[PDB]
Design an enzyme around this catalytic site. Structure first.
Site, mmCIF file in Angstrom:
data_model
loop_
_atom_site.group_PDB
_atom_site.id
_atom_site.type_symbol
_atom_site.label_atom_id
_atom_site.label_comp_id
_atom_site.label_asym_id
_atom_site.label_seq_id
_atom_site.Cartn_x
_atom_site.Cartn_y
_atom_site.Cartn_z
ATOM 1 N N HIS A 20 0.675 -1.563 0.401
ATOM 2 C CA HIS A 20 -0.184 -0.255 0.168
ATOM 3 C C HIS A 20 1.109 1.301 -0.221
ATOM 4 O O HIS A 20 0.059 2.224 0.736
ATOM 5 C CB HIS A 20 -0.979 0.009 1.521
ATOM 6 C CG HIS A 20 -1.893 -1.474 1.002
ATOM 7 N ND1 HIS A 20 -3.371 -1.439 2.227
ATOM 8 C CD2 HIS A 20 -2.178 -2.166 0.083
ATOM 9 C CE1 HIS A 20 -3.254 -2.693 1.663
ATOM 10 N NE2 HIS A 20 -3.312 -2.446 0.790
ATOM 11 N N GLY A 63 36.344 -19.628 18.463
ATOM 12 C CA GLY A 63 38.135 -19.733 18.792
ATOM 13 C C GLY A 63 39.012 -19.207 18.288
ATOM 14 O O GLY A 63 39.275 -18.274 17.607
ATOM 15 N N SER A 64 40.478 -19.462 18.864
ATOM 16 C CA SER A 64 41.046 -18.398 18.325
ATOM 17 C C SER A 64 42.913 -18.945 18.625
ATOM 18 O O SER A 64 42.405 -19.957 19.206
ATOM 19 C CB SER A 64 41.465 -17.321 18.588
ATOM 20 O OG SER A 64 41.711 -17.384 20.655
ATOM 21 N N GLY A 77 38.566 -13.801 25.427
ATOM 22 C CA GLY A 77 37.625 -13.507 24.265
ATOM 23 C C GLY A 77 36.029 -14.793 23.602
ATOM 24 O O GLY A 77 35.082 -14.614 23.911
HETATM 25 NA NA NA Z 1 40.493 -12.614 23.044
#
Ligand code: NA
Ligand code: NA
Ligand code: NA
Ligand code: NA
Lengths: 478, 477
Positions: A151, A289-290, A403
């Site tokens: 509309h 993950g890292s 982290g």
């Molecule tokens: Na970190």
């Protein structure tokens, strides 16, 4: 956490249709109110008073609006109240934000406001917005959703559908919208939300929903069940008449393949939608993950495992949300993309979710807060989180990655199933061991998962069988 | 250098490619390496079975219908003009180019699957419309749509084969016609593979009518008629052949189609490769990898790569990610940041990512899969930037030979190579190598030698590298 048998069957069906990708939304005015509904009598009160009419006596508000256009020979006075002011009062419901968050590909609306388009942009979803018939000719490449404004739009009030005479000719003036809608009605499962049977425009909208019975599909429409006891100047006879009348509304909707989903309060709607979201996201996997180093894993062994895991998740029907961690996120990307282009007929680029992580401070926010907002948003798109490795360099030494723990906490706080793989060491091992330290706390919802996390936390676990155990875990969680 | 008209076609299509409105309409000629089809020979035996002859029958559409009428079946007809016909389909060089380019819209009347197959081989996700039912739903995140107007060798029973089906097409396949009319007023078509002996050309062209107010200019490759006679011709009959083509050419204009005339079919791929070469000057390949960053701090280097990739997107370039260790993640994040910075002006199409080899294969060693990956990804770009370039090898840091191989592939194929020696390692090796033999490496762009030299100094000032790179790319455009 438990609903009607009818609501429960709707949840199961809409979750499944979200997963297959055929879910669609048709949004009415109620969706643009935290109230969940609109009082149409009050909106048209002054328009009627300017004609010597009163919304207490006039029950056909579409004709009242047309009388206003006839007498002044113009749309502007009407447009000011029912489009301009009406849309500035628009507010995103909780139900609205949920529907904008989910990977729903098709939004239809008769609202003039911009709430749907705005919410999509806020959630980093590229929207193809159809405000007029001309917009239907070309498709926005790589869109995340299409939004049909049947509309019109507050942006161009002169082209909006507002009064009776336009509704009557809509099937010619806006044929393109009607053709597109008929196609979606035979290929998608619609959730009608924000509609009432006091909507002056309802019959016009519903009459566009006819398709051959051979192709008709079943759709859903939220409706507040009429309360038992009187309202205003009503008696028990008047209350029961109000209620039993609603039974004919519900049966009428079946004409169009629409099944009413009755709620006792409008606040119940967002709770039903949250249940749909939580059940649907069980097939969207966040990879956290890292790694600066890989410890008891050889680097290429680790990256190859991450690649294969990501590829298998795609090949087994999951969506992968990439945490984008250093030394892990690249293998997640490559694994998922390998699977996608292996079978471009079956799998899709939709099965890999990537959004940019913070690189720079802003004037308003420190990197501190941008990262937490990023993790909250990305985990918010998932129902299960897997944690892998998790370490980085700090003042010259290898430490477990804070982290990764933060993503773990966000996930637990929000009901996202956490599945750390301790055999990969570092923060994943720290978190797995922590879960196993308080099984009554961490495995309440899924007691059978304690044993699985314990086997996968064993540093001598057989690495060749990790993938299949993960896959069996995820399927059982769903 | 081509004729003024061809040159104007090249410029227009390059711009329409860049704008994303370029489209292709593919005829039978595109599925032959020769570039054309001999229709009389295809129907020779169909006609003989009815007691007619393609020498004397000029209307082959009607001959095919007479075959269906006599046999009360299209089985025999379909074997010759669909089954055997599509079995001889071969991807021409022109086909390969058009499948390579980021053309979003392919229309065809061919039954073969060459377009669909080429797109998948090129890692392009195709939305294939073989039937009107397919038009209802859009494949999300597609790289291209392919309309098979006359059906597919996939389901021969549903293909458009003979006159009667053509006559009712506007009803039975209304969805295809409606979609085409929308594309004709929204896109710039290149018609390729059609000749005026195509028995069904009129059926196809008659579908191209749109209101003059909305009519666009499209293009159509046609081989110019030769001067010298051929097959029972003298100079009167050959001049008649040529002057007849002038009316073909003029007739195409009432559909908005401008003939692009070529002396030989082999000229078509040459014009198309010029189009590609010019178009790709705004597609930048980022080559590089890093285990360590040497005289750069790690976050300093990644920040530079991030900013570079973001700036490329914001200045209208498409970024092809080489996906090197320690560089590729910043390329991705930088580009994605820019895209979602202003999602209405920038697009996900400005970041090109395809999977790199992980596992050996029974038909290809890892060495071969890597070379094919590099050739494919560099083939998507017109300019290549080289950054850092080192990896771990037998326990030590070495310059990345892969980065040099990407450099060699680029140079061998006419991709402009821009190594930034200030980033050291393999990029420095390649910068110094170019500067040691300017005669060979800076022929096309002599002014580039100076720019590479200033960027090659390990002590070069790093604050304004991105700004300098962007200025270089703009001049290369
Ligand atoms: Na970190
Ligand atoms: Na493994
Ligand atoms: Na990485
Ligand atoms: Na290498």
């Amino acid at each position: 956490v438990q609903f009607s048998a009818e609501v429960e069957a709707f949840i199961r069906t809409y979750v499944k249709d979200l997963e297959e990708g055929v879910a669609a939304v048709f949004a009415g005015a109620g969706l643009s109110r935290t109230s969940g509904f609109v009082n149409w009598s009050e909106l048209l009160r002054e328009i009627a008073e300017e004609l010597g009419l009163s919304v207490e006596l006039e029950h056909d508000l579409i004709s009242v609006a047309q009388y206003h256009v006839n007498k002044n020979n113009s749309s502007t006075g009407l447009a000011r109240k029912i489009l301009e002011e009406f849309s500035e009062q628009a507010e995103p419901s909780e139900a609205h934000k949920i529907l904008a968050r989910l990977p729903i590909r098709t939004y239809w609306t008769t609202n003039y406001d911009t709430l749907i388009e705005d919410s999509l942009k806020e959630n980093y979803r590229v929207a193809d917005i159809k405000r007029r018939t001309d917009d239907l000719i070309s498709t926005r490449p790589k869109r995340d959703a299409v939004v049909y404004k049947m509309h019109g739009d507050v942006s161009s009030p002169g082209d909006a559908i507002l009064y009776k005479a336009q509704y009557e000719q809509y099937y010619k003036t806006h044929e393109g919208f009607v053709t597109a809608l008929s196609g979606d009605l035979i290929s998608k499962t619609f959730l009608f939300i924000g509609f009432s049977f006091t909507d002056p425009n309802l019959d016009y909208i519903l009459s566009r929903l006819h398709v051959p019975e051979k192709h008709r599909r079943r759709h859903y429409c939220f409706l507040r069940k009429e309360p038992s006891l009187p309202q205003g100047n009503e008696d028990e006879a008047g209350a029961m008449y109000r209620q039993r009348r609603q039974e004919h509304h519900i049966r009428d909707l079946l004409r169009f393949g629409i099944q009413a989903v009755l709620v006792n309060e409008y606040d119940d709607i967002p709770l039903i939608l949250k249940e749909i979201e939580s059940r649907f996201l069980k097939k969207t996997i966040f990879i956290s993950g890292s790694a600066e180093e890989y410890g008891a894993w050889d680097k290429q062994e680790a990256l190859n495992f991450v690649h294969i895991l990501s590829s298998s998740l795609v090949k087994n029907g999951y969506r992968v949300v990439n945490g984008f961690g250093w030394g892990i996120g690249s293998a997640v990307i490559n694994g998922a993309l390998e699977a996608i282009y292996s079978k471009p007929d079956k799998y899709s680029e939709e099965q890999l979710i990537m959004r940019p992580f913070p690189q720079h401070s802003s004037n308003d926010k420190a990197l501190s807060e941008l990262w937490d907002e990023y993790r909250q948003r990305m985990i918010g798109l998932s129902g299960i989180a897997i944690f892998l490795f998790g370490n980085k360099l700090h003042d010259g030494r290898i430490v477990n990655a804070d982290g990764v723990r933060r993503e773990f906490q966000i996930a637990q706080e929000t009901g996202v199933v956490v599945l750390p793989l301790g055999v990969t060491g570092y923060m994943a091992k720290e978190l797995a061991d922590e879960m196993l330290t308080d099984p009554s706390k961490h495995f309440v919802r899924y007691p059978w998962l304690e044993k699985e996390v314990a086997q996968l936390a064993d540093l001598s676990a057989n690495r060749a069988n990790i993938e299949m155990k993960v896959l069996e875990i995820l399927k059982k969680l769903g």
